[PDB]
């Protein structure tokens, strides 16, 4: 009961991957764990039902190790109110919101540590290196976010077309550091990573700006290997994915020491090769 925790997550491969629980069988296969997802009956009601699904991935594997080592059980569910977390009219949604408003004891996934989030929740040590990278077609010459094609887009004819996925930690950072770039970008907003990668390969987009760890994963599995990160590898606003906890959580230092232990004894690097080995 005290060691049975409400935990929230969000789908973003290869860190969190959601699979339909198959019928007839009722169970979740060997390497996956149960996760539930609140699905609405209709749009003229508040009525809904929790659909049982199955979750796997890097962060889920991390969650299992923590569950063993720190000794707790959990009820994992998928966020439905927004995604990773955005402050809207001074109110947090997404995974950050679920923790802030105490519907979840912790949040696990591709959750980026930044300053404004650290004000309303406690973060574990970073367990996945990330930040802001730029994905382009191979050969494209851009220094990075600080390149003047991004900073002052209309100084070029035709203007460089680049965009991000809104409402995440990447957009928050650009809005604060590069006001002109940001208000220029908005017209090239993408609904998600998949859309953006399609826009790149068909020439409708020149660059895609996003989370480094996800972009690096997608570069290594691109067909033709002509979609690369601009570094290639270097990162702006270096930070990490972290486990989000309620402010002053009693689980914090145990989770921290556990994650650091995983790093030191080789378990972390093996999860990397298991989930994030590419071809390119």
């Amino acid at each position: 009961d005290d060691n049975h925790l409400s935990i929230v997550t969000l789908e973003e491969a290869p860190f969190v991957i959601v699979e339909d629980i198959d019928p007839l069988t009722e169970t979740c296969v060997r390497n996956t764990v149960p996760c539930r997802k609140f699905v609405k009956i209709n749009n003229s009601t508040n009525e809904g039902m929790n659909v049982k699904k199955c979750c796997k991935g890097f962060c889920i594997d991390i969650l299992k190790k923590l569950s063993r080592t720190v000794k707790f059980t959990y009820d994992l569910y998928l966020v439905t109110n927004g995604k990773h977390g955005k402050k809207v009219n001074n109110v947090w949604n997404g995974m950050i919101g679920e923790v802030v408003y105490q519907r979840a004891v912790m949040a696990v996934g591709s959750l980026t540590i930044n300053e404004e989030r650290s004000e309303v929740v406690d973060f574990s040590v970073p367990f996945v290196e990330t930040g802001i990278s730029v994905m382009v077609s191979r050969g494209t010459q851009v220094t990075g976010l600080s390149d003047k094609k991004f900073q002052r887009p209309h100084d070029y004819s035709p203007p460089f077309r680049f965009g991000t996925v809104p409402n995440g930690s990447t957009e928050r950072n650009i809005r604060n550091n590069y006001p002109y770039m940001h208000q220029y970008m908005t017209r090239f907003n993408q609904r998600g990573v998949e859309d953006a990668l399609v826009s790149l390969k068909t020439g409708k987009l020149d660059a895609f700006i996003y989370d480094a760890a996800v972009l690096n994963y997608k570069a290594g599995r691109d067909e033709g290997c002509k979609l690369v990160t601009i570094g290639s590898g270097y990162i702006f606003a270096t930070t990490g994915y972290g486990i989000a906890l309620q402010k002053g959580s009693p689980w914090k230092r145990q989770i921290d020491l556990a994650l650091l232990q995983f790093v030191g004894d080789g378990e972390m690097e093996e999860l990397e090769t298991l989930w994030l080995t590419g071809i390119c």
Binding site: N114, S118, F236, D265
Partner: protein
């Protein structure tokens, strides 16, 4: 109260120079034209192991000093900087049944220091005893060799299956030392390095130039700076294990949350990258 800051000599994060005749720091400038922010730091001059350690005022500057200055102005505190007395980062050792910390770790716990500002690696062992900030630098481990030396990296048979023919080493009582001592599959390498470990990074680096050491395993943030600065040295194999540097504090510290928030802010608003551009590397090689 005034924060006792302990640091350690480690270029390009901490440079350590003699004061001038009058006891002041020479006014110098950076590569980009900016003035170098220097502070007075007391510390021993004689570095011999097992020798008396008389402290003299000296001049410190660099990446970590600029960070300290920023942190001091941001959170409104005053500081006294001194160099760690035994010149070590810090490990935990049996004495003997009892165990103790040495290096900067020891000084932070004994109360000789209130804060560690240094390229100090975050790991499980240290985190049990002290509080780390969020990392102010993401890096890893790599290998420094002399140019012309050819090894694949950490899995090279001359490392995994060692002899006196090819000597490699790290720094005594460091996080890299802890790293190879803990993991049992690295045991063969640990027993080789244990015969050859150097007292400081500078000495090990000089030893590689002097063909007295064939491979030096250490922080890549440091080794890559040296290889860019000294063209007779190169790094090979690149990062084989990621690690980060954090600010060290006792678990009691009232500054720890606001220090970490300040770190996060500096990553996000480009201040850390300005420091990297200023201090970490900007030169060559071919």
């Amino acid at each position: 109260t005034r924060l006792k800051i302990v640091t350690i000599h480690q270029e390009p994060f901490v440079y350590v120079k003699p004061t001038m005749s009058d006891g002041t720091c020479k006014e110098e400038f950076t590569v980009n034209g900016d003035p170098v922010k220097k502070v007075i730091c007391t510390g021993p001059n004689d570095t011999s192991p097992g020798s008396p350690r008389h402290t003299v005022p000296q001049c410190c500057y660099g990446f970590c000093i600029d960070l300290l200055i920023k942190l001091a102005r941001t959170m409104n505190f005053t500081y006294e900087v001194h160099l760690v007395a035994d010149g070590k980062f810090g490990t935990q050792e049996r004495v003997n049944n009892k165990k103790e910390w040495n290096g900067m770790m020891g000084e932070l716990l004994s109360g000789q220091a209130d804060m560690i500002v240094a390229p100090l690696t975050i790991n499980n062992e240290r985190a049990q005893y002290i509080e780390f900030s969020k990392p102010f630098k993401y890096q890893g481990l790599t290998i420094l060799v002399k140019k012309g030396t050819r090894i694949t990296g950490i899995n090279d048979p001359r490392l995994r299956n060692p002899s006196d023919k090819f000597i490699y080493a790290t720094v005594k009582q460091s996080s890299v030392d802890i790293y190879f001592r803990r993991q049992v599959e690295l045991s063969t390498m640990y027993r080789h390095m244990e015969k050859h470990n150097y007292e400081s990074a500078a000495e090990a680096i000089q030893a590689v130039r002097d063909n007295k050491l064939h491979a030096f395993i250490w922080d890549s943030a440091v080794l890559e700076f040296e290889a860019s600065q000294k063209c007779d040295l190169v790094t090979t194999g690149e990062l084989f294990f990621r690690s980060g540097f954090g600010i060290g504090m006792r678990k009691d510290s009232p500054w720890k949350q606001n220090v970490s928030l300040s770190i996060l802010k500096s990553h996000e608003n480009g201040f850390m990258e300005d420091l990297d551009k200023t201090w970490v590397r900007y030169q060559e090689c071919d």
